[PDB]
Every structure is written in structure tokens, then in C-alpha cells.
Amino acid sequence: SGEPVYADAVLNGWLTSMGLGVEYVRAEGNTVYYLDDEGREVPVLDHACGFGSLIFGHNHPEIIAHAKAALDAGTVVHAQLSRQPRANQISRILNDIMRRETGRDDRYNAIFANSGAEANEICMKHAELERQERITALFAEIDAELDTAREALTTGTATLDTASLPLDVDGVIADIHRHNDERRAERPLFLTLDGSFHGKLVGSIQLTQNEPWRTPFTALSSPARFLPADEPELIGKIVEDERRSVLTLSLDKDTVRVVERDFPVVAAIFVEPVRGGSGMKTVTPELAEELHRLRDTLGCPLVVDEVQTGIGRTGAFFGSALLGIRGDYYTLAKAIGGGIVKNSVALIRQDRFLPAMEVIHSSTFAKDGLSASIALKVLEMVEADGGRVYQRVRERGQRLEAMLESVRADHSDVVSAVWGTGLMLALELRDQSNATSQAIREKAAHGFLGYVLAGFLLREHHIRVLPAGPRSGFLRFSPSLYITDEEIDRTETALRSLFTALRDQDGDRLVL
Amino acid sequence: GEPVYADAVLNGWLTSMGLGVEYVRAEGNTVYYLDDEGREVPVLDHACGFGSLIFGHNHPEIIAHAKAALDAGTVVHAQLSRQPRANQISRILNDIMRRETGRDDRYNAIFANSGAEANEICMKHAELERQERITALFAEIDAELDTAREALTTGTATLDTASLPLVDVDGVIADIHRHNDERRAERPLFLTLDGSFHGKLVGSIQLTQNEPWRTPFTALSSPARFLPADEPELIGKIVEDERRSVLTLSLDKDTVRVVERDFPVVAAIFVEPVRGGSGMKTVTPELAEELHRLRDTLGCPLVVDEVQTGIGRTGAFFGSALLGIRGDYYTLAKAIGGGIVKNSVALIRQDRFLPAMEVIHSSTFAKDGLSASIALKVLEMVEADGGRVYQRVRERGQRLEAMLESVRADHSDVVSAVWGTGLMLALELRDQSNATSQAIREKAAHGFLGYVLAGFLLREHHIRVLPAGPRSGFLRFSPSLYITDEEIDRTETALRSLFTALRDQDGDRLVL
Ligand SMILES: Cc1ncc(COP(=O)(O)O)c(/C=N/[C@@H](CCCNC(=N)N)C(=O)O)c1O
Ligand SMILES: Cc1ncc(COP(=O)(O)O)c(/C=N/[C@@H](CCCNC(=N)N)C(=O)O)c1O
């Protein structure tokens, strides 16, 4: 209509036209409820689950009860600049878990924040502290090399070689200082994988491939180079083209030369163990070895974003441990809030950790007492009974993956693949840009196909699926570890129904 | 030398300042620590989450509403579904702003997880607006270049060679396109006030004056120019130096000239109504009028950061309404989570709001059901009983300000001023860098004075104060609206004690 609206007009307009215009009024385990026209609750199976936030489902009774107990105990939520031992206690548990799963006896400092993106930006900031340490060291050495060369050229023990000048003593040194100062002030680069998703704040958005989400904001912040994960022979040459030089004077016996030395341009490499923005593709061993090489070569940290793959989703606590990704920094977020509060953590290896970070970084809401308590509960639950929860994820993941595989095998004309691991899975949809049906074709063309297919699943089978990937070309399946055999069977029926409709090009049934 | 997993440096530093205490419980204006015998010691909290706790710690009505929302099975994670509570919150905030400003302006709401995230939504939207202006300018320049190319080939006009020092028809146009393309890719500027605090993420940190917090990160993101608030005759010339030009061809009858046109460099102006990082200084009417002039002149939005001054702190809902600051965008955070959860909102004027922002911006945890419910409760509480809560803040503020003034008047040798409004107040400490006492002098020299004085207040009067401002040169007083007459008297006694010890240069009593 034409009445005043104060939020979400465009978002709601667009959700309605996709068939996703529903208000969920209540949620319990793997079920969200909307009201029909008569005001009765209609149960919907949730495969989205806060984009993998709800490993234990919606409003887990043990988490709700813990939260209520912490509220009634008068938990100190706001205790800024006082002792909060729970931060140390959480970091200790995460350290013990990482040692168990990797067999490495490595120690990590924890910095807390309020979202996945804030945790990735603590890592970007710390990576840049490390880069400024390397730069200070390099520039101190260059000053000493310049002083030494200036001794040998004035004293008279050496001659300037004029073949090097395409890069008078005092004038050449001032031209070097100018060149070097320009280089020093240039923005660094981050390296990501193609399809990368690392958040949407001013810094983190540059690390997210999705072109409409990022390219309006290019001018604001340091960019990333999106390395091709599938073609990792081309990564070496792409990173090689980003080499940059500072100048110094090199004294060898009686000849002084202007020479190029390497400048640290790359602040950090980011990687998701399972690539959310890419349709849940797992990092292959070949790509892991290439990211290890780049980290060893450039001397910048490798940051492992486990915002989505952490707290058990993959069948281990850390998906990095499962896939052999050997990171310097790790980030966690989604499941650590128990599906009720907001919390995130950067783990930074203690032998790289710059203690200035503990006093120059802060946030009003970070390390709050309520999300600290709930974190310790979530970690108790995921660790309980000698790690049977991870075994439950692996066994539920296998059941759900096998079902999605059984559907692909009979629907390979519209389903190109199953991707992911544990309970972080996706179907890849074949391109429908040449679809017989105009309505399907137009939606594929605008990048809206997955959204439309999700509407079908909602209105005809009462199943909530959300798409992933850049043109909604993937369907996400990230339910809780309590997903039942009967819910997996109902999803199978729904998907055969959906993919039979798609084979038949039934635009009247699929598109509203 | 035992294994530590967080906060070693932060805790070491708090201990040496006299602030090494663990709060075990909190209620109203009181936090509790345990003495050596295990008894709870009540401490009066003047810090209150840096102005998060207008209603105090764990307000029974907020705790009860939170428990009710959890027991109702509120949907916390309902991403890409209808969430009418966002619209309902934005509507209440719109109604309140109309009442306090008399302006019938409408605002769209985008939610986030922290004060910094809300400021970065504003930075991102400001940059969308700047990219619209740029597209418009570049379209006009293409048309001007086509018209000038007609008149120079057709033969109706002559190129004036006096204008060529800004760069043959085709070659001059290619030199213009190159110049313009370089300009287009340059990072924008933000304008802030000196002492500004707008958060500490990759983008927002550039908007925060405090040099140790910001300067390590300079290379990452667009900078700000910190305008001098006190001397606003110099603002004009500082913004004037940041003028940048693109080139075009100007056809005037039969002469074509290369000319400079204005390029939109400034993405946004940020302002706090009460300047947190400046020791709680209120924006004066002269400075307000200068920020209005800059916004009208540059055509970028004025973003009013009410993360700290919002939700009633100043004796109105919006401190911008109280001080006559006419913003385009507003941010809120601290008190809106009820002292228990994390939430923030950007209000953007609907006649500037670019609907792409509703579908290209998102966050996992933003607009969650729990903080949405608690927001509506906090807004009900602050609006209740025909605005008597604002009256209570004004009346509590006057009582606390009068007390701080009565202390300054008798302790003007060590207290230089009282700043702020409502329940957002501070004492300015006189410089102690020339202090008789070595231990006081050394602490003043490291910028640690306010922290040390806060330790005295904790161990001797059981009062929690934290410093503000860049060299901890201010003491913050931002308690809840329930602060009692007796708590204000106990603070007076504590401060006379502290400032008599400081007058006497009693370093053995003040510094551990
Ligand atoms: C691997 C990774 N790193 C960072 C973040 C950011 O953390 P934050 O959101 O700030 O808490 C996330 C979130 N992943 C979900 C997010 C939903 C955002 N909205 C839409 N995608 N529509 C996803 O890929 O869809 C992440 O997965
Ligand atoms: C006006 C304004 N804009 C943004 C933020 C950041 O919002 P966020 O912290 O990200 O939620 C704040 C916080 N202001 C307080 C406390 C900061 C929290 N602790 C430190 N980081 N210092 C201050 O002046 O000390 C703000 O006041």
C-alpha cells in the first residue's frame, strides 16, 4: 500500500515475490512456526538455522535454562576494565581442544568481539601490527645500509656504480627516502580465495568476493586478491605480480649500488575450511599446501575463519583440524552464542601475539558476562561424554549427505553436485539461464533461482531452505545435530518434488 | 610464569593501577567483589558500561522481560523472513525524534551488533551516496566531452590553448579520462571533531582521534580530518584544502576550455552531541552551525553518533535534539540492549536512503528476536508516564553536576572543569606532569593519572570510576537514573578525600 514504513520495505517486497514472505512466531529444536489465516501454528523444518548458528537447534532447553540462571544470579554483563577470568577460562578450553585435534602443543591468546566480522577485523588489525613491526625492522636496516654506503662514498673507499641509477650521494639518498616513504604509506593487500565470505563491515567487506555486496565500497578500505582455489598453479604468479620493492644502497668491497629489497605488502591470508560463499566447498589438501607455502613465503599470518565451520559443524570442533589447515590466527562466532546471544573470538598464536593489542583494542560489549557464561555452557555441551556430540554430527552428516547424493543421482539433470562435510552441506543447481519456461529463465537471469526454489519448498513441503553462493546457485542444508531420520525423509520427498517440477519446467508451480 | 590464555597484559596493568578486582554480582548502581574472607563488598558504579546502564545493572523488569522472551520460544535466528519488530522499533524511534525536534522527518532502520557496526553501516551508506554523486558527475562530463568534440571537429569552435596546462582533441580527452579515473579510485575522507570516538574496527578506528589506538592502523582504511571544535574559524580552510577537481571540456559559444569541476571527496561528517573522547564536552551552538554549513556545502550526510548520548542519558532521548544538531543519519547502541544483550541501529533519512542498502548489507546476528524484544521493552520503559524518566535524568543530572561543581570550586588547584549534560558528566584533572611527588609525576607522564586516582576511589571509598579522554585526564560520572542522594554524598566525600590527597602530593597513598 502507501502507509508509512520504517524498515525492511524493499527486503520484505523482495522476500514476498520469492515465496519467502513468512513471519516465524516461535522456534523449538529444528522447527520454526508461522501462523496460518486461522491463527494455528504451522511447523516448518529449518535447514538454514541462523546460517549454521544452531548446532543445538533453536532455543535448546539447556541453553535457555543456563541463560535464565545467569540472569537471575545477577551476572556482571558490564565489568569493563576489571578482572574477567571467564575470558581466560574460555581461551583455555579452546586451546585444550585445538591441542587434542591437531596434536600441536601450541598456545593462543583470545580477544573477544560481538560478530564474525568483528573477529575477522581483530585479525586484520593484529596482522597489520605484525606488518608494521616487519616494516620498522626493514627501515632500520635500510638506514644502517645507507649510513655505511655514505661512509664508503665520502671517506673515498668506494665508487657509486651509475648502471644502478635508473632506480650524487646526498641527492640519491633523498630520492631513496622519498620512494621508500611513498611505499610505506601504501595500503596493504589481503589474500582470500575466490567466493570468500569474511563479513560485511568496512574492512571485512573487501575480503568478500560477492560483487554487488563489495564493489560499491572498493574505495574505503584495503583490497583482497581473490586467489583461484581450483587452479592453484596460477596463485604463485598472481602473488608474484604483487611483489613491491623499497630501495637501499648495497656496499660490496669498493662498488656501491642502488638495489631493490622486498617490501611486506600482504597483511594476511584468510581461508574458510568449508567455503560458505562458494557453496560449501571443502579446502582440498593441494590448496591447503599452497596456503601454507604462501604463509611461509610472505611471513604474514594465515587466518582461519571458523565463524561457520567451528563448534562441531564439520564433525570436529575445528574444521581446520579435520582438513589439516595449519593457521596462525583462528576466528569463531556462530554457535558460541548458544543460538541466543552474540559473541566471537580471535585466537592469535602466543609467539606472534603483540601485547599492545590487549590495551589498544577494545569494544563496549565484548567479553560481557552473559555471553561469557553461555560460551562456557556451549563448550561444556559440545565436549560432554568424551566427544559423543562430534560423533553425532558425523553420523547425522553422513545420513543427510547420503540422502542428498541419492537425490542428485536421480536428478543430475538439474543438480550438478553435493558439497561440504559434517552438517554443513549444499546442493549445486545446474544453470537455468536457458530454461524453456520464461518465468524460471527470468529468475535464473536475475540470480534469484535458489530463492524461488526455496519458496517452493516452504509453501508445498513446509521446509525452510536458504540459498548460498553468488547467484543463489546452491541450496544450503545446515540443520542441528538433532535432525531426525523422519525430517531427512521429508526433505528427500520435498527435493524429489522440487527437482521433478524443475525437470518439467513448471513455471506456474515454481514462480508466483 | 604459569600458562595464561587471555588478558595477562590487561590484568597486569589494571593491578598496578589499583583496579585489579573481579566483580562477582551486580544490581542497580552496585557491583560486588569478594574480600579476602569471602564477604560481598558493595561498590558504587559510576562507569556503568561506559553509559550502557541508564536503568542500572540487571533491572528486574528487563531481566523478567528477557526470561519471558526466552520461555515464549522467541525466534532469535529468522534471517531472510518477515521481522516486523524492526519496523516497530524504527517507528517508535521516528515518533520520538519528531516529538523532540518538531521535524516531520522519516528514517529507515538498519540494525547491527555494536556501536562501531552502526557507525560503519553509516560509513557504507555515505559511500553509496558518494558513488551516486560521482556516477551523475561522470555522466555529465561524458556529455560535456561529446558536445565539445562536436564543436571542435564539425569546426564551430576553437580549443583555447591557455587552458592546456591542465593536461590535439582526442589526446586532450584521453588525458582528461586518465586524470578523472585516477581521482575516481582515490579513497574518500571522513570529517570528525578532535577527540572524536566512533569505535575501533578497521573502518571506524580511522574516525577515532586517540593516537595509540589509531595510528598503527592508518594504512588500512580511509582517514578522517579531525576538525578543531574550539576554533571553528579554521575548519573552513582545513576543508577548503581538501577540495579536489576532475577535468572536463566547457563549450561557451565558439571557445572550448579545459576546466576544473568539484569532485565529492568527503563521504560523511561524524559528530557526537557530547564528546566522549574529549571528556564529555557538549557541542556548542557555534560548532553545530559550522557542521550544518559543511553538510549543506559538501552535500555529504552529517552522521550523529548517539551510541553514548542516546536513550535518555542527556535528559532527552536524543542529545542531538537537545543541542539542535540536525543530522541526516543517527546511530544508537549502549542502553538499547537493556544492559544484558547487544544491539545497535542506524537511522538514515528516507529521502537519502538507497534501497540497495536493504539487500546488499546484512549480518548474521543483526535484527535477532531476543535483542528486538528487549529493545521494545527498553523503549517502553524510557517513554513511560508521559516522559517522567527524562525528567528524572535531568533532576538526577542537576544533583550530580551541582555536587561535582561544589567539589571543583573547593579543589580548583587539581580540578580544571565539569563537562557534560544530564547523567553524562566528567571532571577535568589539571596536568600533574610537574608534580612534586615522583610516583604521581611518573604516572601523569605515562598518561595513567586518571586510572591511579580511580584505584584510590576503589580501595578507599568503594567507588568505581573510570577515566575518559586521551591521557586519562578526565574522570567519568555516568551512573543510572536510580543514583540516590546518599550515593551522590558518598561520591562527594570520596572526591574531597581524593583531591585533598592530590593537593598534598601523597604519592605513597595514591600510587601502589
Ligand atoms: C565464514 C564467515 N565469516 C564471517 C561471517 C560474518 O560474521 P557475522 O555475520 O558478522 O556475524 C560469516 C557468516 N556466514 C553466513 C552469514 C549471513 C550474512 N547474510 C547473508 N549471507 N545473506 C553466510 O555465508 O551466508 C561467515 O559464514
Ligand atoms: C560515541 C561512540 N561511538 C561508538 C562507540 C563504539 O561502540 P562499540 O564499543 O563498538 O559498541 C562508543 C563507545 N564509547 C565509550 C566506550 C567505548 C567502549 N570501550 C572502548 N572501546 N573504549 C567511551 O568513550 O569510552 C561511543 O561512545
Sheet of A424-429, strand order: A415-421, A424-429, A474-477, A467-468
Whether A405 and A362 map to the same domain: the answer is no
Whether A363 and A391 map to the same domain: the answer is no
**Residue B191: which of B222, B224, B155, B156 has the closest Cα?**
B224
CA of A78 to the centre of ligand 2 (A): 13
CA of B295 to the centre of ligand 2 (A): 24
Q: How many CA atoms lie within 13 A of B269 on its CB side?
A: 26
- Our CA-based measurement puts residue B90 at a distance from the nearest CA of chain A, in whole angstroms, of 5
* Residue A91 located in a structural domain: no
* Residue A348 located in a structural domain: yes
Domain-ending residue, one of A367, A394, A428: A367
Q: Do B127 and A219 touch (CB under 8 A)?
A: yes
B400, three cell numbers = 550530580
Pairs of CB atoms within 8 A across A/B: 331
Report the CATH number that the domain containing residue A209 is assigned in CATH: 3.40.640.10
Task: Decide: A199 in ligand 1 pocket, CB within 6 A.
Answer: yes
Cβ proximity of A477 and A47 under 8 Å: yes
Whether A205 and A286 map to the same domain: the answer is yes
Whether A56 and A201 map to the same domain: the answer is no
A239: phi then psi, degrees, rounded to nearest 5 = -75, -40
* Residue B370 located in a structural domain: no
Treating both helix axes as pointing N-terminal to C-terminal, what angle do A449-461 and A438-445 enclose, rounded to 10 degrees?
120
Task: Decide: B19 in ligand 2 pocket, CB within 6 A.
Answer: no
| DSSP assignments along A205-260, one per residue | GGG---HHHHGGGTTTB--EEEE-SS-TTSHHHHHHHT-EEEEEEEEETTEEEEEE
- Cα–Cα distance, A451 to A473 (Å, whole number): 9
A86, three cell numbers = 571467564
Treating both helix axes as pointing N-terminal to C-terminal, what angle do A116-154 and B115-153 enclose, rounded to 10 degrees?
70
| Contact partners, residue B99, CB within 8 Å, separation at least 6 | none
Q: Could you tell me the CA-to-CA distances from B3 to A81, A95, B7, B305 in Å, in that order?
A: 22, 11, 12, 41
A26, three cell numbers = 516461535
Report CA torsion sign: B400, B405, B407, B408: positive
Environment class of residue A485 by beta-carbon count within 10 Å: exposed (0-12), middle (13-18) or buried (19+)?
exposed
Contacts of B72 in chain A (CB under 8 A): 26
* A28 in reach of chain B (CB within 8 A): yes
Q: Do B107 and A6 touch (CB under 8 A)?
A: yes
Task: Decide: B342 in ligand 1 pocket, CB within 6 A.
Answer: no
Contacts of A364 in chain B (CB under 8 A): 49-50, 52, 114-115, 333-334
Q: Provide the β-strand partners of residue B226.
A: B192
B413, three cell numbers = 588547584
B396, three cell numbers = 538526577
* B124 in reach of chain A (CB within 8 A): yes
- Cα–Cα distance, A209 to A226 (Å, whole number): 7
- Provide the residue type at A285 as one letter: P
**Residue B100: which of B427, B497, B390 has the closest Cα?**
B390
Cβ proximity of B249 and B144 under 8 Å: yes
Report the CATH number that the domain containing residue A422 is assigned in CATH: 3.90.1150.10
What atom in ligand 2 is closest to the CA of residue B306?
1
Residue whose Cα lies nearest atom 17 of ligand 1: it is: B364
Substitution site in B46, B48, B50 for ligand 2 pocket (most atoms within 8 Å of beta carbon): B50
Whether A358 and A430 map to the same domain: the answer is no
Which residues form the domain of A336?
107-367
| Contact partners, residue B280, CB within 8 Å, separation at least 6 | B274, B419, B420, B424, B425, B426, B468, B474, B476
| DSSP assignments along B276-322, one per residue | GGGTSEEPPHHHHHHHHHHHHHH---EEEE-TTTTTTTTSSS-HHHH
DSSP A283: P
- Name the one residue in this structure whose C-alpha cell is 575470558: A87
Residue B120 C-alpha from the chain's centroid: 11
Exposure string for B431-463, b = 16+ CB within 10 A, e = fewer: ebeebebebbbebbeebbbbbbbbbbbbeebbb
- Cα–Cα distance, B317 to B311 (Å, whole number): 5
- Name the one residue in this structure whose C-alpha cell is 584510590: B456
Whether A362 and A394 map to the same domain: the answer is no
Task: Decide: A114 in ligand 1 pocket, CB within 6 A.
Answer: no
B14, three cell numbers = 589494571
- Cα–Cα distance, B358 to B83 (Å, whole number): 13
Chain A contacts in chain B segment 172-201 (CB below 8 A):
185-188, 199-201
- Our CA-based measurement puts residue A169 at a distance from the nearest CA of chain B, in whole angstroms, of 31
Domain-ending residue, one of A367, A396, A421: A367
Strands (E), B97-234: 107-112, 158-159, 189-193, 224-227
| Contact partners, residue B117, CB within 8 Å, separation at least 6 | A114, A115, A117, A118, A201, B199, B201, B344, B363, B366
* Residue A3 located in a structural domain: no
Chain A contacts in chain B segment 61-120 (CB below 8 A):
63, 66-67, 70-84, 86-87, 89-91, 93-94, 106-110, 113-117, 120
Whether A392 and A302 map to the same domain: the answer is no
- Provide the residue type at B171 as one letter: G
- Name the one residue in this structure whose C-alpha cell is 583531591: B499
Cα dihedral A375/A378/A384/A390 (nearest 10): -120
A247: phi then psi, degrees, rounded to nearest 5 = -105, 150
Whether A357 and A297 map to the same domain: the answer is yes
* Residue B287 located in a structural domain: yes
* Residue B32 located in a structural domain: yes
Cβ proximity of A110 and A409 under 8 Å: no
Q: Do A213 and B360 touch (CB under 8 A)?
A: yes
Q: Do A88 and B7 touch (CB under 8 A)?
A: yes
A449: phi then psi, degrees, rounded to nearest 5 = -60, -60
Q: What spatial distance separates the first Cα and last Cα of chain B, rounded to whole Å?
A: 22
B305: phi then psi, degrees, rounded to nearest 5 = -85, 100
Q: Provide the β-strand partners of residue A251.
A: A256
Instruction: Point out the residue among A32, A91, A117 whose CB comes nearest to the CB of B6.
Output: A91
Whether A256 and A215 map to the same domain: the answer is yes
Specify the number of domains making up chain B: 1
Whether A284 and A394 map to the same domain: the answer is no
| Contact partners, residue B322, CB within 8 Å, separation at least 6 | B100, B273, B314, B315, B316, B421
Whether A259 and A391 map to the same domain: the answer is no
Domain-ending residue, one of A321, A340, A367: A367
The number of the ligand nearest the C-alpha atom of B200 reads 2
Whether A230 and A350 map to the same domain: the answer is yes
* Residue B467 located in a structural domain: yes
DSSP B253: T
Cβ proximity of A275 and A52 under 8 Å: no
A449, three cell numbers = 533461482
Contacts of A219 in chain B (CB under 8 A): 127, 185-188, 222
Element spanning A477, H or E:
strand A474-477
Residue whose Cα lies nearest atom 25 of ligand 2: it is: B50
Which residue of chain A is at minimal alpha-carbon distance from B45?
Answer: A79
CB atoms within 10 A of CB A424: 25
B56, three cell numbers = 542500572
Substitution site in B53, B307, B314 for ligand 2 pocket (most atoms within 8 Å of beta carbon): B307
Task: Decide: B210 in ligand 1 pocket, CB within 6 A.
Answer: no
Q: Could you tell me the CA-to-CA distances from A226 to A193, A219, A238, A469 in Å, in that order?
A: 5, 17, 9, 15
* B162 in reach of chain A (CB within 8 A): no
* Residue A98 located in a structural domain: no
Instruction: Point out the residue among A14, A68, A79 whose CB comes nearest to the CB of B67.
Output: A68
